[PDB]
Design a protein around this nucleic acid. Structure first.
Ligand SMILES: [Mg+2]
Ligand SMILES: [Mg+2]
Ligand SMILES: [Mg+2]
Ligand SMILES: [Mg+2]
Ligand SMILES: [Mg+2]
Ligand SMILES: [Mg+2]
Ligand SMILES: [Mg+2]
Ligand SMILES: [Mg+2]
Ligand SMILES: [Mg+2]
Ligand SMILES: [Mg+2]
Ligand SMILES: [Mg+2]
Ligand SMILES: [Mg+2]
Ligand SMILES: [Mg+2]
Ligand SMILES: [Mg+2]
Ligand SMILES: [Mg+2]
Ligand SMILES: [Mg+2]
Ligand SMILES: [Mg+2]
Ligand SMILES: [Mg+2]
Ligand SMILES: [Mg+2]
Ligand SMILES: [Zn+2]
Lengths: 145, 53, 158, 69, 101, 67, 141, 112, 143
RNA sequence: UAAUUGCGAUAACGAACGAGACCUUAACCUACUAAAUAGUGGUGCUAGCAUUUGCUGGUUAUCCACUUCUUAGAGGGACUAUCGGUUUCAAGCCGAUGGAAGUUUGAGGCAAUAACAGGUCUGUGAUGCCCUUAGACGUUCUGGGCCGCACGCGCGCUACACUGACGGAGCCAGCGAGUCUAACCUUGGCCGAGAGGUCUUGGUAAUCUUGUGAAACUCCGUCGUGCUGGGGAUAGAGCAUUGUAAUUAUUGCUCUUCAACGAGGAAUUCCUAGUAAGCGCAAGUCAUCAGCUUGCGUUGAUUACGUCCCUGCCCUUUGUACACACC
């Protein structure tokens, strides 16, 4: 009974936050293809923004897409719990963030550089490129390429 | 009563030894035996353990 | 007490093994053969079967009551809840632990391996067993070790 | 890459090639006509809602339909 | 006239069996109701360990078993008869415990 | 396979030697006989004795044997 | 009163205790109808006895089965036995020998032994292998 | 298997067990080829097939064909087994079962 | 002529009781129903968001009818599953005790389950009565 | 014949060890003894619906009765029984019937002589000799290391997907373990997304944890041939637990990052039925840590019922320039 009779307003791959978002896949997994955001946070974002879960990403057009993107940038104001974000109790401010498409790589490099500048053993391992978690490199880690 | 002569051994090996040879390796602690496996093999026939199958 | 029957029975087994080790260590000279824990609530009875029970109650029960005090304080019982008894071991010849003790005595004296072992095996066979064998083994004559097996009679193996 | 929405040309197609064959299934729909599976299942739901196909059996992993008569 | 429970256990089946036969015999010449013994599941104490003293050779394992057999009988007897049962019936290895309730 | 050993063969031969009139042609009766006139200590071994004894009884009725 | 018989059915670990009595003619497992057991395709496996002999011979019998142990296939293959042995035991104890016999002929003509249980038992596992016959892979090098 | 035989009924009105029997009959490999020591090129010699081995190899060919033709596809195991059974019932040089039968027969008539 | 939840099928009855609890609505669900995974052994939240809690309520009510008394530990053990630990083998991990107890006390504040001695929760009078009447309508749903 | 297992032959006769016999376990017992620490049925009290008797339940001081299922102890049962073939017509073998069981019924335990210059003095207050024995190679304390990584191998665990992943519901085991002068297995209630925390409770244990409500499966739904919702390595941030102490993350949980892998070359391992394989659970080491082992159960195929071609083994004959013996 859920056949859709729309003709023209469907669209192919689209743009959202510096990422090529696929247009003929489901909305939650297209948000997953956006970097810095996974399946569970995407599903939560769609349900909380009252966006139609059932179908693809051709319609679910602009105004709901900016509802999506603004609850992505400011999650804490709309009863998204503090532990659901990826970076909480931060470096120098203590306020909870969610890093997105470019900021995730920029800030992982930033805190790696922080630990390199404080001259941690973790920094020494990340500098040599070895396994920084406690792992046995005697037998694994071959063919780094 | 002397200080500087002991370190906390209340958990794990060291705190437990074999009651026949004061060994720390290969203890059997099932049913509170507290004996090493080799000694256990020697004294099993006197303890009461008999192999059947 | 309040101990599970599982752990109580296995602790009784460990108790029996410790008595055996104790009485082998000190009771070697008079030919200790085997102990039995005749457990009775309110004064358990510990029967020692040995060869020279005159040489356990030698001087007016002296060493038997100091062994009683030793086992008492070793196993933390109330005084008078355990007493040792002595038995001559009927059929003393047909006791493998007594034969091993006698051969240990002969080898500590300095008897020849062949002579002492033939004496032991012939003594068992004349005492009335159906088979006997002695497997003394080690550095007997030269440096390299050798096993000498003295088997007389009839022995199953399986 | 397949078509996962109906642009009404796939719709009046599947309306006109429902008598063409006999054994209706998800994979039959996918191979005869380029539908990306989920719309084929939705179309099966719509056609069993108004059945010019009739069902033989309706397990989840596979649905077996043939023509109305 | 007190209703008590007597519970015996051992590892040697035959001496446990003739302990229990003695107990049921004595209760039967001094009947209380009939109270035949109730036989519990045998507890198999399983201890598995390696044969080798060192760590060399084929990996062969061994399983020693202890068998715990445990029975109980209910008696509803006066004082001296409860006593005379509990000191007369006694054999090596079999551990017998009496509880008032 | 089911080859019978020297214990059962020797025993059954002795039984059929010195107990021919009493022993019957049936396995059940013959094993009750073996239980009563032999102090055998194994049940399966007793069944083997009786089975081979029955086999020899049938062969004796068929014809004379050398054993 | 209550002319009832108690039978059992075993597979590998499942015990199905069937109470078979003279009543209106109902057949139930775990307090629920046979038409509601959940092995999905083995609904016919349960019906097998009821069906083979014929509904007629059950039109006067109330059977209730209580089931313990073993996985789902073990559960169903045990009901089969109980609703067939309880059947055979009831026709033994109360009705004609020719009737019980011809039921035995039908059961042994079609049988997956039904009335008798399977002697196959899980053999014990041996050291040196994760399975009962299979051993660990050796290397030589 | 129930779904497969349902698909068999939908594709053709005849009995699905008759379809299975016809498929096994038409894909039993009549002539196999065995191994001979044969110092040098280690030879093979054509040998006929006992009827139970015919039936076993027939069922094995059917199921292996269904497996490999529905490993990574939209089509399910029931559909693939049903179409393989249909084409094996009417050998149309399309079943993997009858293709393996045909290559077995041609290699046997070459190696005899 | 004689109706019980044992006499009605499971899936059907569970769908119909979920639909009834949807039509009534007095369940006072917690605010974090969209957040949860229903177990730490899961990785995705439930798909049918509008009725997963009510289906859980239907299943728990049927469970309380079927058994004598169970608790949140028994419910977590039942509704748990296999946890994917990555390259390591699967294990059984218990379900979400918070939503299990929320649905339990929600059924309490309806009046379907209550506190049973020696610990536990057991089926109520009107709870057994309304589960039996909806078992009826699922029996006579036939046209 | 599985078997120097037997029939027999016979300068050998009579014996012995081993094999077998034996012991344990898994199967059968509506035959015995029993049993609120295992159950079942009825009776009372009580709850729903139908009401017309009924169906599903609950109930410890409601009793009564029983042992089919559950436990055991004592026994019985299979000995290849009967029959038909085949064999000097003997040992036996094959087929069928009956039977719970007809591959020494299945599986183990134990298991000879002679050896290896097999391993182990790091299990042993078992040890000879040598070394050391007081700024000791004794012992103890602090901190590291045993994890260190250009690489090469050996056990494995996840997988490379729709016979599937996920999401709901359905819903079933067996082997076992558990606290006393200690703090174990934990039910139940409450807080918490979760891990976990807190207040109590039961259990020294067929009673309580625990019906260990296990997982694979079953059903209905989302996905859709896309390295994709497969796969979850490598990373970053945070929250907890154990511990005196976690930094080279002990582990657990949450979010994010989402790599190789598209079924694997030469080669090579294991396996004949409830076996392989899949699936989890318990125990061991354990304060914490299983991808390991030892057991257990769940689901349960295919293909042989042979041969000596490869790898070897046993016996006999034969050849030998070998005897540390074909390396
Ligand atoms: Mg296995
Ligand atoms: Mg589940
Ligand atoms: Mg897996
Ligand atoms: Mg009642
Ligand atoms: Mg014959
Ligand atoms: Mg054997
Ligand atoms: Mg040594
Ligand atoms: Mg140190
Ligand atoms: Mg190491
Ligand atoms: Mg290995
Ligand atoms: Mg699933
Ligand atoms: Mg159980
Ligand atoms: Mg995944
Ligand atoms: Mg462990
Ligand atoms: Mg560690
Ligand atoms: Mg290890
Ligand atoms: Mg020559
Ligand atoms: Mg020479
Ligand atoms: Mg050479
Ligand atoms: Zn030791």
């Amino acid at each position: 009974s859920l056949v859709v009779q729309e003709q023209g307003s469907f669209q192919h791959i689209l743009r959202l936050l510096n990422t090529n978002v696929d247009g003929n896949i489901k909305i939650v997994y297209a948000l997953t293809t956006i970097k810095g955001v996974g399946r569970r946070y995407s599903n939560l974002v769609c349900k909380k923004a009252d966006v139609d879960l059932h179908k693809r990403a051709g319609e679910l057009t602009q105004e709901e897409l900016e509802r999506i993107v603004q609850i992505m940038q400011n999650p804490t104001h709309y009863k998204i719990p503090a532990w659901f974000l990826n970076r909480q109790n931060d470096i120098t401010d203590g306020k909870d963030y969610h890093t997105l498409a470019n900021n995730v790589e920029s800030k992982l490099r930033d805190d790696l550089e922080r630990l390199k500048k404080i001259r941690a053993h973790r920094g020494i391992r990340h500098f040599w490129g070895l396994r920084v978690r406690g792992q046995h490199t005697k037998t694994t880690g071959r063919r780094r390429a | 009563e002397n200080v500087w002569f002991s370190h906390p051994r209340r958990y794990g090996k060291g705190s437990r030894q074999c009651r026949v040879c004061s060994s720390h390796t290969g203890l059997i602690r099932k049913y509170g035996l507290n004996i090493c496996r080799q000694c256990f093999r020697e004294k099993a026939n006197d303890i009461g353990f008999n192999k059947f199958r | 007490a309040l101990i599970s029957k599982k752990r109580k029975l296995v602790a009784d087994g460990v108790f029996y093994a410790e008595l055996n080790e104790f009485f082998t260590r000190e009771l070697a000279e008079e030919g200790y053969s085997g102990v039995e824990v005749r457990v009775t609530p309110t004064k358990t009875e510990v029967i020692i079967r040995a060869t020279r029970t005159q040489d356990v109650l030698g001087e007016n029960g002296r060493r038997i009551n100091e062994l009683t005090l030793l086992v008492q304080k070793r196993f933390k019982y109330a005084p008078g809840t355990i007493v040792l008894y002595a038995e001559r071991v009927q059929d003393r010849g047909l006791s493998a632990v007594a034969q091993a003790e006698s051969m240990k005595f002969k080898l500590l004296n300095g008897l020849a391996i062949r002579r002492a072992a033939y004496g032991v095996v012939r003594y068992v066979m004349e005492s009335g067993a159906k088979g006997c064998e002695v497997v003394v083994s080690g550095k007997l004559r030269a440096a390299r070790a050798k096993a000498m097996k003295f088997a007389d009679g009839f022995l199953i193996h399986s | 890459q397949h078509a996962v929405i109906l642009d009404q040309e796939k719709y009046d197609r599947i309306l006109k090639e429902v008598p063409t064959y006999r054994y209706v299934s998800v994979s039959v729909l996918v191979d005869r006509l380029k539908i990306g599976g989920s719309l084929a299942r939705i179309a099966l739901r719509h056609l069993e809602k108004e059945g010019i196909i009739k069902p033989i059996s309706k397990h989840s992993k596979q649905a077996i339909y043939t023509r109305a008569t | 006239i007190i209703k008590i429970r007597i519970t015996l256990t051992s590892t040697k089946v035959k001496q446990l069996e003739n302990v229990s036969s003695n107990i049921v015999k004595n209760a039967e010449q001094h009947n209380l109701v009939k109270k035949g013994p109730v036989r519990l599941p045998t507890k198999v104490l399983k201890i598995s360990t390696r044969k080798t003293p060192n760590g060399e050779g084929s990996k062969t394992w061994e399983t020693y078993e202890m068998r715990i057999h445990k029975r109980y009988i209910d008696l509803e007897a006066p004082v001296q008869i409860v006593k005379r049962i509990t000191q007369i019936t006694i054999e090596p290895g079999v551990d017998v415990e009496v509880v008032v309730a | 396979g089911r080859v019978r050993t020297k214990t059962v063969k020797r025993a059954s031969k002795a039984l059929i030697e010195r107990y021919y009139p009493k022993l019957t042609l049936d396995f059940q009766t013959n094993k009750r006989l073996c239980d009563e006139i032999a102090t055998i200590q194994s049940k399966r071994l007793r069944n083997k004795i009786a089975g081979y004894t029955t086999h020899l009884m049938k062969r004796i009725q068929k014809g004379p044997v050398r054993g | 009163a209550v002319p009832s018989v108690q039978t059992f059915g075993k597979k590998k670990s499942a015990t199905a205790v069937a109470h078979v009595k003279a009543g209106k003619g109902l057949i139930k497992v775990n307090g629920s109808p046979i038409t509601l057991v959940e092995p999905e395709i083995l609904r016919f496996k349960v019906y097998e006895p009821l069906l083979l002999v014929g509904l007629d011979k059950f039109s006067n019998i109330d059977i209730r089965v209580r089931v313990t142990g073993g996985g789902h296939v073990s559960q169903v293959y045990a009901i089969r036995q109980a609703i067939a042995k309880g059947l055979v035991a009831y026709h033994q104890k109360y009705v004609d020998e020719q009737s019980k016999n011809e039921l035995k002929k039908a059961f042994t003509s079609y049988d997956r032994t039904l009335l008798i249980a399977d002697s196959r038992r899980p053999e014990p596992k041996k050291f040196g292998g994760k399975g009962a016959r299979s051993r660990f892979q050796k290397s030589y090098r | 298997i129930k779904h497969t035989l349902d698909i068999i009924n939908v594709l053709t009105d005849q009995n699905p067990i008759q379809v299975v029997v016809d498929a096994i009959t038409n894909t039993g490999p009549r002539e196999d080829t065995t191994r001979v020591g044969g110092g040098g090129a280690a030879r093979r010699q054509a040998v006929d097939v006992s009827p139970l081995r015919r039936v076993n190899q027939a069922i094995a060919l059917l199921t292996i064909g269904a497996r490999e033709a529905a490993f990574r596809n939209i089509k399910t195991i029931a559909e693939t087994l049903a179409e393989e059974l249909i084409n094996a019932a009417k050998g149309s040089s399309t079943s993997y079962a009858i293709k393996k039968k045909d290559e077995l027969e041609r290699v046997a008539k070459s190696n005899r | 002529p004689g109706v019980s939840v044992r006499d009605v099928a499971a899936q059907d009855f569970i769908n119909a009781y979920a639909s009834f609890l949807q039509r009534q609505g007095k369940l006072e669900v917690p605010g974090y129903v969209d957040i949860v995974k229903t177990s730490s052994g899961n990785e995705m939240p439930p798909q049918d968001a509008e009725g997963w809690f009510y289906k859980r309520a239907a299943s728990v009510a049927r469970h309380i009818y079927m058994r004598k008394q169970v608790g949140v530990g028994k419910l977590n053990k039942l509704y748990g599953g296999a946890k994917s630990r990555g390259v390591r083998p699967y294990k059984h991990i218990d379900a979400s005790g918070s939503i299990n107890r929320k649905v339990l006390q929600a059924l309490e504040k309806i009046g379907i389950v209550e506190i049973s001695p020696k610990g536990g929760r057991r089926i109520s009078e009107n709870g057994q009565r309304d589960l039996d009447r909806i078992a009826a309508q699922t029996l006579e749903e036939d046209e």
